[PDB]
Amino acid sequence: MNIIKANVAAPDARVAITIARFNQFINDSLLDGAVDALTRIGQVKDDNITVVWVPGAYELPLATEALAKSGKYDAVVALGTVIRGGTAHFEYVAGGASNGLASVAQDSGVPVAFGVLTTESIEQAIERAGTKAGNKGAEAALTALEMINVLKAI
Amino acid sequence: MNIIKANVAAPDARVAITIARFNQFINDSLLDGAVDALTRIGQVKDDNITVVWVPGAYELPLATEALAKSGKYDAVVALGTVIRGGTAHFEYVAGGASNGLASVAQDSGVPVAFGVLTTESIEQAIERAGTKAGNKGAEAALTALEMINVLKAI
Amino acid sequence: MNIIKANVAAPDARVAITIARFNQFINDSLLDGAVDALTRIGQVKDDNITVVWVPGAYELPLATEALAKSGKYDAVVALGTVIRGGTAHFEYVAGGASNGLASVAQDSGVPVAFGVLTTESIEQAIERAGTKAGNKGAEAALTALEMINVLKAI
Amino acid sequence: MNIIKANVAAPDARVAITIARFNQFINDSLLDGAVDALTRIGQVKDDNITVVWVPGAYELPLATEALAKSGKYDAVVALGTVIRGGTAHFEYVAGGASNGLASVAQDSGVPVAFGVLTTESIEQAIERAGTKAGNKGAEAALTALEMINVLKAI
Amino acid sequence: MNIIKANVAAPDARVAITIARFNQFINDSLLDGAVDALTRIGQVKDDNITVVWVPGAYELPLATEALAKSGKYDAVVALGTVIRGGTAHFEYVAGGASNGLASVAQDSGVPVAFGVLTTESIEQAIERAGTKAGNKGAEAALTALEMINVLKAI
Amino acid sequence: MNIIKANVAAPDARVAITIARFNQFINDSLLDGAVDALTRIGQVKDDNITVVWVPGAYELPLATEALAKSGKYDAVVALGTVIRGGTAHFEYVAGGASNGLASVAQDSGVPVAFGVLTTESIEQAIERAGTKAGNKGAEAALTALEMINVLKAI
């Protein structure tokens, strides 16, 4: 009975990170984690890493869509934070972002890593941006790499 | 390691704004903000700015879809307010509006700026229409411009 | 009837930022915002940007006074955080800082941007240092540039 | 992009300390901290350190003004404690003291360090006079030195 | 009666920093503080500063032990954060870390600076990583330098 | 200024895992995580992985001590669970185990990874054995590898 377990190391890869600058106070750490992950762990040569700042998290799809359709990249890591406010604006951003990104991956066949924090408080976001609950940035980066290989293995 | 940071200035652009006239009391300020942003900040020549009033916010997609498929515009800024009422009508308007718009952008490759307020009270809308919490109109306008360049940079 | 609306782009400008290192955990993001604002948005060439770290926020005036009297700069952005403690020390720091800076601008005719957080909690400061409520750093930077032009227009 | 970070060491400096004798039980430790800071850390030769006792904290300005107009000193450290009492006397002392001092620095161009405790209780003053919350004396002394260099660097 | 007061300036020194990457969101500021302290204050030439990232805070001892036994360094600054969780895991990490480090110093005769935050909340860690309660990174760095001299003075 | 960041890949390594069979219901997943980590991520050839079952978690030290003194291994990963009961037996097990292990590492210079759960409830242990809070097994395994390299880099 045959099995596929992939590895996160994948040096000959070219990876794109899309970050939202809104909330960058958090997103910065989110990046640091991802970049480090990519290079130090997945052996990515850091001139194959390209980083694209879009303004809001809402833009992440369009941006990563471009990058995937480009064919220039083996996977896109999508980094952002969306913290809930007084209105249901939170709902539609994080929604049209989750689904936007998921769609892009499904059509382009390129892995997209969902490294978007969707919290209730600034507190929680800090917790997932490189503290108690690890670093969703580095985590999304890793799941990106593994995915490259997982796919490549078919 | 290469990076893309875009700028909001983009004078040779032609931009389309779609506004819902329902709730115009708020949407009017939403516009003023956007228009000013576009011209004063993004250097847009104001005969490249075209403004399209549709009746409800629910119509924003169809209207912007037309504009994007037209190819005549580099980006569409979508302006509107949807305040929660006694029924779940609020849900389906803001929903089919967030997703409608998000889709149009994804297919047309044209950036669509989601400057649609989705509040609980008239109070909250006023807060986001050019007071305490800035002006989502001008903000959506800016994210539109930055996106033009962000894309252009690939 | 004649009107003056200025723009935030002003590339041939030389700008000075004064930062307090006390509370730098927050002030760092405050900076990043401002710097990015200046260059990416206001087209400032980054060797016309000079950054001066003073120890406490209380020192911001004297420091920016020097810079303005110097005439070497078109405007000074003042960055710092002052969080309220158990004593009224908070009052006199933020006071002697608001008024110190405001005075310097008034005598030197050089614009001084008041990008000093004055919060009740660490929580609030984080909110204004590049999260929910934007980035008072980049905001102060922008109001600086706009001012340059607003003045220049007379 | 050019930056100014200063150092606290500045041996060839001549510094003046003005202390209020009222509340000396606290102010004494306030001094010790400062003096030690100055010499041991900032390398100040202790015959360039001069110490001036005024009676109340209210007098700190006039005294430091003299010293700064004198030109004999590179900076003045102002040490004192003002604890809140039953009346609003507390308000006018700490007020006319914060602003007096701040003004002197602004006109004389000489750095003045605001090492005046402004507490609600004797308890709080003890906390900032060389216990849990460090020593505002030595802290004011250091911010003085750093300022000397920060200025000198323009 | 003879006395030893040391200074924090010690330029001809070679210093090693060991940081835990877990919780780096905080540890990053912890570092910045220390590095700045070292160079700007203690006059350390920044090619004599070496920085070693270990994964967990639990590893700090072993890593600093190596560095001290090496003899290549005059002191090691140990930076990390340990925030309390739902289990007593917190106890054994911070414990085996405090004692690990303390032991290494005692055997190697090399100063080891304990700049490890041991808090109850993310909130508290932020407070000690360069805000209200200063920067334990820079503070640990300073106590490192002073120690070098304190020892050297016997 | 020179820096050491290590990688978790280290294929030519020979690693020993010590597991306590008490509580194996949890420890089993703890292992699976570690083993997978080692091979799949750190490229360890799985005949260089040796696994040693000791009865209680209290024994983990003695067992790993032997293994490290043996010199046959580059690092030992210590896996086990200690859940708090009605008595303070919990205290002495987890204590004599944290310190035992930490000591072994310090004397043998071999890295020892502390992958011992120290929880209050069975619930919490399950959370850290490959669910919400990841898998301390695989985490301990990774910190082992990274350590090998971190040390090798001096």
| Number of other CB atoms surrounding residue A127 within 10 Å | 19
- What separation in angstroms does the CA of A58 have from each of A100, C84, C134, F48? 9, 35, 16, 48
Which residue of A63, A67, A96 is in closest CB contact with B99?
A: A96
d(CA E147, CA E128): 22
| Number of other CB atoms surrounding residue A1 within 10 Å | 2
Contacts for D67 with CB less than 8 Å, ≥ 6 apart: D16, D18, D52, D73, D76
Test the D interface: residue of C17, C23, C36, C58 with most D CBs within 10 Å: C58
Q: Which residues pair with E75 in a beta bridge?
A: E15
Contacts for B113 with CB less than 8 Å, ≥ 6 apart: B75, B76, B77, B78, B140, B141, B143, B144, B147
The 3-class SS string of D74-122 reads CEEEEEEEEECCCCCHHHHHHHHHHHHHHHHHHHHCCCEEEEEEEECCH
Nearest one of B118, B113, B121 to B137, comparing CA atoms: B113
A131-A136-A137 Cα angle (round to 5): 105
Domain hosting residue B124, numbered range = 1-154
**DSSP letter string over C73-126?**
-SEEEEEEEEE--SSTHHHHHHHHHHHHHHHHHHHH---EEEEEEEESSHHHHH
d(CA D154, CA D151): 6
E3 CA: distance to closest CA in chain C (Å): 31
Gyration radius from chain B CA atoms: 15
Nearest-10 Cα torsion for F143, F144, F148, F151: 60
C109 CA: distance to closest CA in chain A (Å): 33
Residue D27 burial (C-beta neighbours within 10 Å; 0-12, 13-18, 19+): buried
Q: Which two tokens stand for residue A82?
A: 């969306």
Q: Three-class SS of residue A104?
A: helix
Q: Which two tokens stand for residue E146?
A: 């002073």
Provide the edge-to-edge strand list for the sheet that holds A75-83: A112-119, A75-83, A15-20, A49-54, B2-4
The 3-class SS string of chain F reads CEEECCCCCCCCCCEEEEEECCCHHHHHHHHHHHHHHHHHHCCCCCCCEEEEEECCHHHHHHHHHHHHHCCCCCEEEEEEEEECCCCCHHHHHHHHHHHHHHHHHHHHCCCEEEEEEEECCHHHHHHHEEECCEEHHHHHHHHHHHHHHHHHCC
Q: How many residues does chain F have?
A: 154
Q: Is F128 assigned a ligand-binding role in the annotation?
A: yes
What is the CA C27 to chain-centroid distance, rounded?
11
d(CA F88, CA F78): 22
Residues of chain E with a CB closer than 8 angstroms to some CB in chain C: 29, 32-33, 123, 126-127, 129-132, 135
Chains touching B (at least 3 CB pairs under 8 A) are A, C
- What separation in angstroms does the CA of C75 have from each of A74, B138, C66, C104, E106? 45, 25, 12, 11, 54
Can you tell me which residue has the tokens 């809930």? A84
What burial letters (b/e) apply to E58-72, b meaning 16+ CB within 10 Å?
bbbbbbbbbbbeeee
d(CA F4, CA E54): 9
- What separation in angstroms does the CA of F82 have from each of C148, D140, F96? 65, 50, 12
Nearest one of F16, F8, F23, F15 to F117, comparing CA atoms: F23
Contacts for D66 with CB less than 8 Å, ≥ 6 apart: none
Crossing angle (nearest 10°) for helices B136-152 and A60-69? 10
Which residue of C35, C55, C95 is in closest CB contact with D143?
A: C55
Fill in the amino acid letter for D37.
A
Residues of chain E with a CB closer than 8 angstroms to some CB in chain F: 46-47, 49-56, 58-59, 61-63, 65-67, 70, 86-89, 91-93, 95-96, 99-100, 103-104
d(CA F53, CA F73): 16
Pairing of strands F15-20, F2-4: unpaired
A15 CA: distance to closest CA in chain B (Å): 11
Q: Which two tokens stand for residue B82?
A: 């949807």
Pairing of strands D15-20, D75-83: parallel
Question: Is D77 in contact with D140 (CB distance < 8 Å)?
Answer: yes
Please, what is the end-to-end C-alpha distance for chain C in angstroms? 16
Largest CA distance in chain E: 53
d(CA C70, CA C63): 11
Q: What region does C151 belong to: left with phi over 0, alpha with psi -120 to 50, or beta?
A: alpha
Q: Three-class SS of residue C47?
A: coil
Q: Resolution to 1 decimal, in Å?
A: 3.6
Contacts for F131 with CB less than 8 Å, ≥ 6 apart: none
Strands (E), E49-128: 49-54, 75-83, 112-119
Q: Judge: A87–B118 Cβ closer than 8 Å, yes or no.
A: yes
- What separation in angstroms does the CA of D143 have from each of C85, D68, E35? 20, 17, 19
Experimental determination approach used? X-ray
- Check which CATH number belongs to the domain holding C90 and give it: 3.40.50.960
A66 CA: distance to closest CA in chain F (Å): 31
Binding site members of A: 22, 57-59, 81-83, 86-87, 114, 128
Q: Is E58 assigned a ligand-binding role in the annotation?
A: yes
Gyration radius from chain E CA atoms: 15
Can you tell me which residue has the tokens 């980049």? C138
Pairing of strands A112-119, A75-83: parallel
Total beta-carbon pairs less than 8 A apart between chain C and chain D: 99
Phi, psi of E110 (to 5 degrees): -80, 135
Contacts for F70 with CB less than 8 Å, ≥ 6 apart: none
Phi, psi of C102 (to 5 degrees): -60, -40
Q: Which two tokens stand for residue E20?
A: 């835990």
Q: Judge: C33–A26 Cβ closer than 8 Å, yes or no.
A: no
d(CA F30, CA F117): 9
Binding site members of B for (2S)-2-hydroxy-3-oxobutyl phosphate: 86-87, 128
How many independent structural domains does chain E possess? 1
Q: Three-class SS of residue E78?
A: strand
Question: Is E145 in contact with E9 (CB distance < 8 Å)?
Answer: yes
Can you tell me which residue has the tokens 């989502």? B136
- Which helix or strand (DSSP H or E) is residue B17 part of? strand B15-20
